Amino acid sequence: EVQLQQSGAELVRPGTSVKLSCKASGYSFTNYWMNWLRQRPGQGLDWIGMIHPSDSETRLNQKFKDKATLTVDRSSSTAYIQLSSPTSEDSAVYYCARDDYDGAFWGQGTLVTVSAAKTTPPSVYPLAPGSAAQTNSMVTLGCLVKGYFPAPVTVTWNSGSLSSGVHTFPAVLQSDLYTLSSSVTVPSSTWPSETVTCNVAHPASSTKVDKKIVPRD
């Protein structure tokens, strides 16, 4: 068959560098060009460049002229790319691919995160109703899970009891740090009478904390 296996998620401290690899197998590595694409968070796809493993001839998208350097290692049929002095603007999922007549095959991609940030447990803040008395019958509370790094974080309400009527929004990486929120809805008869708490974990910090959502004064 055919396959393009890429290296594991890499963390890159801004202003330094990284080198990702794509292991070719199941075909004559040096017979076709090797493409390298990028896909920033939420964005579409950017074609970085391509290199031919036969003679290392490279052809680069001029936008990455000074950021990407493409190389190949015939012996182990691996193709490499090296990001030179990457910014946060370079955080994304990098792919290698062969898209030609003899077939189009893509690697599983490599996540790259550029951030000076170090392991950081999140600040868990309770989102309690301001003063919208009842609103109706149902009530929604929330938990602001702010400032952690790296990702991800697990958020559950009342240790798993509460599952329906919950929305844990995708984390947004802003200014070196990840921030995310989660909401929950329950009948006005259950809260504040009972006790709603979000239990959020952050594996990288070996942390897991609970935040009782107290009725606002």
């Binding site: 052809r59 893509w106 803040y125 309770p126």
Partner: protein
């Protein structure tokens, strides 16, 4: 450079029903030989892009004849005779006649359903957060449809946008509605210099702005 305008950005399909996506190029892809280089890829959530059609209308290996590419020069279309669950995702358009090769923003398939107004809840900063010097106001606009919504934070009087971060959940697979979190972040003094905080949404279900605000009192 060469620009690929795909559309619509998000297509609402109905399982079993047909679908049509459009992709135009800022210039002709009709090359000097006979080949007009234009392919479509399909990225199913969490997967790597998978080329489906190459050279305007040639299907790839194991491609249900349900997908049909066609087009000429600058206008191209991808059609699906009857959308199946597995087709859902983002479809990409890519050209290779011009250099560098370029993609369209991608068209996202989404299951249609009935319009639903969003529920809105605004949350004042956590004292716990204040103590730390910061202050974020959170707004949740849950379970709404269609996905298209317009949110603005109005402080006391006017609109403002410094320190605003929004996040969107994928189309819920249970009800097929969308949810959006919106966080306005201020310093504690910045926050304390104002009284009124409003979360204003303009959705198609209401000819009137949907509001939920709170004063610091």
């Amino acid at each position: 450079e060469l620009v690929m305008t795909q559309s619509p950005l998000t297509l609402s399909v109905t399982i079993g029903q047909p679908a049509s996506i459009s992709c135009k190029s800022s210039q002709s892809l009709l090359y000097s030989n006979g080949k007009t280089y234009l392919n479509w890829l399909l990225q199913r959530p969490g997967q790597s892009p998978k080329r489906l059609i190459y050279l305007v209308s040639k299907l790839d290996s194991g491609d249900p004849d349900r997908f049909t590419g066609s087009g000429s020069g600058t206008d191209f279309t991808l059609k699906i005779s009857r959308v199946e669950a597995e087709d859902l995702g983002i479809y990409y358009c890519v050209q290779g006649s011009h250099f560098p090769p370029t993609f369209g923003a991608g068209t996202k398939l989404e299951l249609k359903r009935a319009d639903a107004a969003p529920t809105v809840s605004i949350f004042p900063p956590s004292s716990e957060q204040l103590t730390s010097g910061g202050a974020s106001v959170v707004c949740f606009l849950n379970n709404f449809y269609p996905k298209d919504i317009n949110v603005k934070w109005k402080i006391d009087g006017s609109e403002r946008q410094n320190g605003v971060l929004n996040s969107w959940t994928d189309q819920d697979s249970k009800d097929s509605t969308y949810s959006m979190s919106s966080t306005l972040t201020l310093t504690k003094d910045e926050y304390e210099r104002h009284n009124s905080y409003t979360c204003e949404a303009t959705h198609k279900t209401s000819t009137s702005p949907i509001v939920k605000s709170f004063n610091r009192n």
